[PDB]
Amino acid sequence: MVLMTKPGTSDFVWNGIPLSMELNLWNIKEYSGSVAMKFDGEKITFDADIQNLSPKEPERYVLGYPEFYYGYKPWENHTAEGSKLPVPVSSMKSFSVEVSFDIHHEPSLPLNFAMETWLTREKYQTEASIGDVCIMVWFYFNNLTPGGEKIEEFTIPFVLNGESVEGTWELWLAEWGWDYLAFRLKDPVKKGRVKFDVRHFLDAAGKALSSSARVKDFEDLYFTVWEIGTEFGSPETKSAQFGWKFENFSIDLEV
Ligand SMILES: OC[C@H]1O[C@@H](O[C@H]2[C@H](O)[C@@H](O)[C@H](O[C@H]3[C@H](O)[C@@H](O)[C@@H](O)O[C@@H]3CO)O[C@@H]2CO)[C@H](O)[C@@H](O)[C@@H]1O
Ligand SMILES: OC[C@H]1O[C@@H](O[C@H]2[C@H](O)[C@@H](O)[C@H](O)O[C@@H]2CO)[C@H](O)[C@@H](O)[C@@H]1O
Numbered sequence: 526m527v528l529m530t531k532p533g534t535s536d537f538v539w540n541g542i543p544l545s546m547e548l549n550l551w552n553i554k555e556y557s558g559s560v561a562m563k564f565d566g567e568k569i570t571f572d573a574d575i576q577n578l579s580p581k582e583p584e585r586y587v588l589g590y591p592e593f594y595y596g597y598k599p600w601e602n603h604t605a606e607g608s609k610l611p612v613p614v615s616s617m618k619s620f621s622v623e624v625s626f627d628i629h630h631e632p633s634l635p636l637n638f639a640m641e642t643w644l645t646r647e648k649y650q651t652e653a654s655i656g657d658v659c660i661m662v663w664f665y666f667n668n669l670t671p672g673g674e675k676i677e678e679f680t681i682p683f684v685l686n687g688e689s690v691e692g693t694w695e696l697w698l699a700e701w702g703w704d705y706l707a708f709r710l711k712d713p714v715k716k717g718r719v720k721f722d723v724r725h726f727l728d729a730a731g732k733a734l735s736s737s738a739r740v741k742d743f744e745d746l747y748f749t750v751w752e753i754g755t756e757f758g759s760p761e762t763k764s765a766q767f768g769w770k771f772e773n774f775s776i777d778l779e780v
Contacts, residue, residue: 526563526564526565527546527564529548529561529562529563530548530559530562531548531560532548532549532550532560533547533548534546534547534548535564536605537564537605539564539566539569539774540774542774542775542776543595543605543606543608544593544594544595544605545593545603545605546564546569546592547591547593547598547754548560548562548571548591549589549590549591549754550588550589550591551589551590552580552581552585552587552588552758553578553579553588553589553758554580554581555577555578555579556575556576556578557575557576557577558573558574558575558576558577558764559573559574559575560575560591562591564593567772568770568771568772569593569770569771569772570769570770570771571591571768571769572767573591573767573768574765574766575764576764577763578758578763578764580758580760583760586672587635587669587757587758587759588758588765589756589758590752590754590755590756590757591754591755591769592752592753592755593752593753593754593771594750594751594752594753594754595608595751596609596610596611596749596750597610597611597649597749597750598643598749598752599643599645599650599651599652599653599749599750600643600651600652602649602651604750609778609780610748610750610778611645611648611649611747611748611749612747612748612778613744613745613746613747614644614727614731614743614744614745614746614747614748615744615745616780617723617724617727617748617778617779618724619723619724619777619778620723620724620748620751620776620777620778621720621721621722621723621775621776621777621778622640622720622721622722622723622751622753622776623684623718623720623721623773623774623775624718624719624753624771624772624774624775625771625772625774626638626664626717626718626719626770627715627716627769627770628665628715628716628755628769629767629768629769630757630765630767630768631765631766631767632667634667634757634758634765634766635667635668635757635758635759635762636665636667636668636669636755636756636757636758637663637665637666637667637669637755637756637757638663638664638665638666638714638754638769639661639662639664639666639754639755640661640662640664641659641661641662641751641752642659642660642723642749642750642751642752643657643659643750644657644658644659644660644743644746644747644749645657645746645747645749646746646747648747648749653702653703654702654703655702655739656739656740657703657704657740657746658703658704658705658706658730658734658740658743658746659703659704659705659706660706660707660708660726660727660730661705661706661708662694662707662708662710662723663707663708663709663710664710664713664714665710665714665715666709666713669756669759670697670709671697671699671705671707671709672697672699672701672705672707673697673698673699673700673705673707674697674698674699675697676697676698676733677733678693678695678696679693679708679729680692680693680694681694681708681725682721682725683720683721684720684721685714685717685718685719686717686718692710692712693710693711693712694708694709694711694729695708695709695711696708696729696730696733697709698733700739704734704737704739704740706733706734708726718773723751727748730743731743731744751776755767
């Protein structure tokens with residue numbers, strides 16, 4: 526059992542895969558109340574009942590992103606030992622990700638269930654800047670839209686509860702300190718099991734950024750990490766009650 530009740534990171538191994546869990550309240554300046562994140566060998570759970578919230582920077586909009594991840598998260602300069610990432614995007618033949626999840630939250634809270642990676646020019650950067658890319662995949666959202674603006678839609682297959690389906694994904698793009706691309710599933714799923722190949726999203730992103738003047742050689746960027754978690758909160762959020770459970774996690778990176 527790994528149990529955290531304050532912001533921090535812990536490495537763990539689940540089904541033979543080395544991972545990191547981060548009770549991530551990155552944009553919260555202050556709060557009162559409770560947070561708890563736990564891994565017990567079969568599932569990872571997170572619960573929060575916090576109040577008196579204020580952001581470190583409202584321009585960033587969200588307040589936090591409790592999560593777990595496989596690989597190297599640039600911002601924390603951290604990877605658990607034994608990860609196959611980072612690798613150049615061009616070396617990835619396929620990268621299957623599967624996980625069961627159940628998200629619960631008070632109705633008014635801005636929240637998503639989103640996975641993400643950071644594509645960087647150098648292998649072990651400690652930040653993203655111009656030339657780098659953040660790609661997110663949102664399977665659920667409540668009172669929250671992605672940053673930037675919606676520019677396209679893509680039809681990308683995934684397996685939902687064991688059944689192959691074709692999802693329709695909106696692609697939202699923002700040019701900030703780095704390029705932000707968020708694919709948002711149009712029929713969000715709040716509880717279920719999903720399995721999909723990240724390569725489809727990398728392919729769509731590479732097409733969308735083909736005429737970019739900021740992102741130069743997409744396929745030469747390093748795919749550093751795969752994060753799974755829930756962003757939550759807006760600049761007006763003063764309290765947050767929500768949590769989640771993730772189970773049945775597996776990956777298959779073919780390089
Ligand atoms: O303490 C280490 C380092 O953390 C920096 O915060 C990171 C977070 O760790 C990371 O989760 C967050 O990712 C968000 C991203 O910025 C958004 O564009 C979008 O992708 O959603 C992500 C999850 O909400 O990025 C921030 C950095 O921007 C601290 O900022 C830094 O001071 C600190 O040293
Ligand atoms: O850290 C940035 C954050 O942006 C979130 O979208 C915000 C956007 O930043 C803001 O300009 C717009 O007015 O509101 C949206 C929220 O509805 C985005 O949802 C996050 O993924 C991203 O992390």
